[PDB]
Amino acid sequence: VRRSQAWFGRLDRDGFIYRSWMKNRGIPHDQFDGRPVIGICNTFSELTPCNSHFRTLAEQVKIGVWESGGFPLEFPVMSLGETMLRPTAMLFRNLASMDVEESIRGNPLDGVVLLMGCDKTTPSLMMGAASCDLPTIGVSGGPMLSGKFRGRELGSGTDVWKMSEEVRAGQMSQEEFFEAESCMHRSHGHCMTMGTASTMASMVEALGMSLPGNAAIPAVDARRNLLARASGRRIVQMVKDDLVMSKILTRQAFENAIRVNAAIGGSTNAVIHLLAIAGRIGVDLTLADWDALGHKLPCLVDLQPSGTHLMEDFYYAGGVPAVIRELGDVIARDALTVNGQTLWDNCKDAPNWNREVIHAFNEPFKTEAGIAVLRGNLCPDGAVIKPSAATPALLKHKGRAVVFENSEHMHERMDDENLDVDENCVLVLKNCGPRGYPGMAEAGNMPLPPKILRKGITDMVRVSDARMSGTAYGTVVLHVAPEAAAGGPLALVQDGDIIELDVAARKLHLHVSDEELARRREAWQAPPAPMARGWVKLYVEHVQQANLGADLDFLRGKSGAGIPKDNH
Amino acid sequence: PVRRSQAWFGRLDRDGFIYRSWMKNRGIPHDQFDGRPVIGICNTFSELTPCNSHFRTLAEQVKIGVWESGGFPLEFPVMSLGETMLRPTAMLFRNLASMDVEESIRGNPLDGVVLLMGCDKTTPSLMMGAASCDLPTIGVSGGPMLSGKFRGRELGSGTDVWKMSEEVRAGQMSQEEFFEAESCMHRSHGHCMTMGTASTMASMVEALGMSLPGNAAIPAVDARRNLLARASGRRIVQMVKDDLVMSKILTRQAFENAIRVNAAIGGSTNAVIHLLAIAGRIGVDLTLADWDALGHKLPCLVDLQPSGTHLMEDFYYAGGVPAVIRELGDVIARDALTVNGQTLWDNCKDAPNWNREVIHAFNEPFKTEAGIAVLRGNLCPDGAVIKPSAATPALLKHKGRAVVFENSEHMHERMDDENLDVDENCVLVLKNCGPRGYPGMAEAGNMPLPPKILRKGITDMVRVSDARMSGTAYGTVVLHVAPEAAAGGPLALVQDGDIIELDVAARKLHLHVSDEELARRREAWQAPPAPMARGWVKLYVEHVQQANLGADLDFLRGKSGAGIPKDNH
């Protein structure tokens, strides 16, 4: 029955081996009796500031299992801290997924609890677990408290760009900027805006992989530990009911996630990770699904980078349950969630305590504010833009290309005061995709050249093959596929070329002949391998493009959780 | 870079905000981004690796020592490897965790690292990926657990599992007396209480100069262990300022000393594969033939299971491996540098021996000519290892009929079949259990003997395979046969009947079959299919190297330093 009994139930020479060592620290023999063993994937790390409190979170989950008669065991994987990993945390997104997948199948686990929070750590565990497909429940770590500074509030990342552009413009002092370090981010948890970590927590509960309310409650709130403990209870039942990830991660679950991602003004990185998760659970989902389901919908939460308020205000207003309830005419209602009820039955009666934060559907915060997927000769395989946090007057715009051949050249050249750029140009950035950076870093939201900032404007049309943080704003076209370092038509844009953007027409058209690109394409040579050694060589030579999830090619798909050979 | 962490923390731009504000979300003084040595502590704690269960208190011990010396301690996780839990074997996952530790050190602002390593595969996976960075690195072993206490006698980790199970199937031990010693064999924190792999690698780390003196043998629940993790936290901060990097410690002299110490302690056969992988990352010429050259003829000075009688607890109380290195005064590279800052002799030249019964003197060796021996012949063209420290002398030179098992499932079913034509003089042959055949190199070399033979009081008969063995195992077991049968090696061609000659004195493993018959047999040989068309295992089979080179992935060999990577925003 249980697969853990292939370890703990054997009455042979091997059963001694799988049991005698586990009893070295005092574990009662009844723990190996056949009750569900629960693996707790602990991404706790002091190098992951947003998950640094996951020791407590695991213990609450551990209590939950003991309450319900299960055998809980926590294990580690590589944790990813978006603020500290370099060249970028996305570079190691796939490496952590192999830790999760192999640690789950290789160990006597019947159920899985995922402690995820910090940006990249949410897809790392969701992707590795989907390839084993045991009864799995996700516990999100929770956001930080809203920043506090001089009687004002500070936003995670969103106020980092706004204040660094304000000092680059010369309108704010550099001393005031660095005085906000300890004042922006107090308290435990992940980014306090509607950035990647917050949307991915919403994606976890929009897909149905968590108990209701899991996304929005802050990390130091008491209900954070309640939900972790309550999910430690539920996962025991799910093992008995065999509620595997296959039954939750249906196509209707991904559509629902896309629907609420546009309703919350979600990160542009949710688009990439959701494709990678679908790529391993075995659900056909392309970028076109995001456009067909997303842009038509309005954005209903008034949170940065799209709005004003923060994740603290968002939870007190009702959180994701209140947002799903308002998508009641478009959500796949009978889509089951991890607690044994459909998504609509967990949110049909969710309250709303503040409509200035969570708007009514019939009176939304921003109309047609869902993410758009652009097509054209410059992005033949797709490119995304987030109009919720973009300038409307720039959504239909045409300008000359100011090209930055890579990120180094972009930093060597952006601050050049004798650069020929005005507000109406189109800043282009190349060689920052999966093979480009390497790792597809959040470099899309380029800081505007200082000459433009002093003029008094903070937005210009920027196109790139890189990502940007969910914390970021502006009119930024991202995930241009194929990337420049792959041979994509982005690699051939030169200074002076005219790029026209019409997000209403899904247009990213490069004004240049089909015959002129072909001579440029002949002189173009792919950049050299950045390491030719270690994980990075494996990454650049195996990672797929941004339009498919930026996953390693041999990691796509599932493999289940069979009972492997005995180890001796 | 002088203080590579200042590329994050000492930045006076926008990015400098990103790298500091987030770290300060739990209350960290701004002066921790001083430029003081930031010390990454790679914690392999997990409840699914019962031998690293106490590492949360170990990691805290390390931090204390870092805080004393004005450093910045940060712990971070990587995939942990519990050998008893991970199937089909924890070896298959060593190189994966090797990538975790390496990328976590290069991508994070770390001036120095502390390695918390206890269970078997947790030492190499941590040492390898650290060697690929060549940063100021200190290793901290978790310690062996207390001896097993059962019915007023002692139980040995791993060793007594083989010997009690071989007594159940021989019909002399209750099927329940086996399972009642279950909770009595392991009753404290730590790794295997024998001279298995986990204690050998702990002895390797200290003999390689990669740890403070006395690091190997300290039991986990003994208080000197926490003191050591605290002392290593003190020491690593000063090494960052001295820029004492791994390549300055892990030189050839260190590896040569490690081969010597492994022989005198009766170390595991698995230490051979892992040091070769460690050398392959750090960039030091070390070949399988070096192990026999430097180590075989050296005497075994340690009277521990599976070679002797006592347990790791006694080994610490007699002076640990420092007392062994002292008895090795006339063979070791005396002037090899260790982590504290003094040569290996200055750390051990006055090491006291409190018990000449478990740590013998050199001139009173427990066993002569007891180092691991590599073999050469038609059967193992790239080398095969054997541990005579736990073998039987009469079968050290032996020839007999072959009884073959095409894979391991075939063995689990044919070995017990009483209709099998085999006596105690036949050579047992097991195929398709090496890096690619199993997959991973599981410890199936110590094959259970035919139940017919065990009823004669026979405990040992010669057994060859391309598999590995438990460091706690024994017998005249030829191991690590390279190339493995799955990779096309000659072992795949052994057939029910061929005579196989063993002579470790001559280092000869010869299969008495014509050379032409073999190439004619290899006509009908077709490689086994990959176990998985997907996942890490697929990458593993198509990139793992053989046991002669350390079983690393080919694209993971060598080092890449630890230069400053590009900004992440």
Ligand code: FES
């Ligand atoms: S830094 Fe962890 S959530 Fe953005």
Ligand code: FES
């Ligand atoms: S089980 Fe960890 S030492 Fe053998």
Ligand SMILES: [Mn+2]
């Ligand atoms: Mn082992």
